Amino acid sequence: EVQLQQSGPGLVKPSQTLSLTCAISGDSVSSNSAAWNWIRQSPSRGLEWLGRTYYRSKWYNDYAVSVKSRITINPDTSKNQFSLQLNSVTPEDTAVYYCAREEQQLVHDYYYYGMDVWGQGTMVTVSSASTKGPSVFPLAPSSKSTSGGTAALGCLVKDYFPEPVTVSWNSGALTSGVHTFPAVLQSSGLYSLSSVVTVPSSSLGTQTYICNVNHKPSNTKVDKRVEPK
Amino acid sequence: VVTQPASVSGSPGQSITISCTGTSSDIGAYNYISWYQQHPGKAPKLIIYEVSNRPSGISYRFSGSKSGNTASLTISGLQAEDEANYYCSSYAGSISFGGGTKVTVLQPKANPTVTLFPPSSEELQANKATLVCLISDFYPGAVTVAWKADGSPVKAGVETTKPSKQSNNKYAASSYLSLTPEQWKSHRSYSCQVTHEGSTVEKTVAPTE
């Protein structure tokens, strides 16, 4: 299994340089048969190729014309990674950025598969506002949240910036009946989000419930115990 | 620049075909055309390479062809898991993606589950009051949320999300009513009202806690 571990989400302030790292494991960054690409995606722009770095005896770079003057991709044989740098960012650079491997088949018949393996993507938001961690409030289960022996309980992840937030329950042990709702953009330009698990109300007295809110952009993690009342 | 239709819909069992059209310098230049499938919040996956090649793991329900300056993808036996974005891409030194096609798998109507949470005593001690109205499991993706206090319609302080695709192709939404702790105490009733097709579903909370 070839896997691409990417560089964690955050905020780049305007006019600064964007910098991301893709770490390969299960393949060599200097592969005969590979190329290491960066691709970004925005809801209004779609998938946008940024460029590639490949090693065929010598090292090589292709870039896309819309970024040719602002971009640098940097392989690292030492660490088995390659990096992306984009200068002089503006809100137009807010996007999810992906690293992908372009793979050619060098055995029997040559095949050109394209982007066969993708990193999970890191969201970069370019904004002049500052990162803010969430405040997490318990949405308590109550006999007024039960419908036939089911209880709904939740965490209100309030007033954070930028995105994203990831929410787990009971450190990832509780996954069935979990519903995490996409965030609302408040008129303050801060985000809020709610996450709920449906659980047997008969387990409220025997099972502890904890939502684990991770906000990588602010190196903050909050675990909130949700008790009934 | 490579054109795809924005949106395609279909019923289970039917067959669908996404057009991908460009120029002699993009799609018709070579036969290095690839198609990708993307579910929301996940990375794209190669499902077709070289116009018609299925990578190992992809069902035969996925077919690919090319004619002239139009490559094209086809999904037979449309299953609910086929709801996703789809993109063609073409190699010519540089790499061009098509604008994307959201593929919907038609489903029967479903009415929403609605859950209303009052403000937590923790948020109230921080001089804040948020009512949270959670709407899930409805189809199609369009709802109307109204809020009322002591029976009277309320517009000040409401923020409601666009519907978003769940993993069962149904839709979720959420709506928040912001108040001060005093207004939360100055009324004896607050309600979230969710309308969808015909049905309306209304839930009420009261500050006696």
Residue numbers in the entry:
A (entry chain H): 1 to 229
B (entry chain L): 3 to 211
Question: Which of the paper's sentences describe this entry?
Answer:
The RBD of SARS-CoV-2 spike protein (S) directly contacts the cellular receptor angiotensin-converting enzyme 2 (ACE2). It is the target of the most potent neutralizing antibodies. Here we engineer two bispecific antibodies (bsAbs) using distinct designs and compared them with parental antibodies and their cocktail. X-ray crystallography and cryo-EM reveal distinct binding models for individual cocktail antibodies, and computational simulations suggest higher inter-spike crosslinking potentials by 14-H-06 than 14-crs-06.
Our attempts to use X-ray diffraction to determine a Fab14/RBD crystal structure have not been successful. Therefore, we obtained the structure of free Fab14, and used cryo-EM to obtained the structure of the Fab14/RBD complex. After superposition of the Fab06 and Fab14/RBD complexes, we found that Fab06 and Fab14 recognize and bind on distinct epitopes on the RBD simultaneously. Therefore, the two cocktail antibodies have distinct binding models on the RBD in the context of the spike trimers.
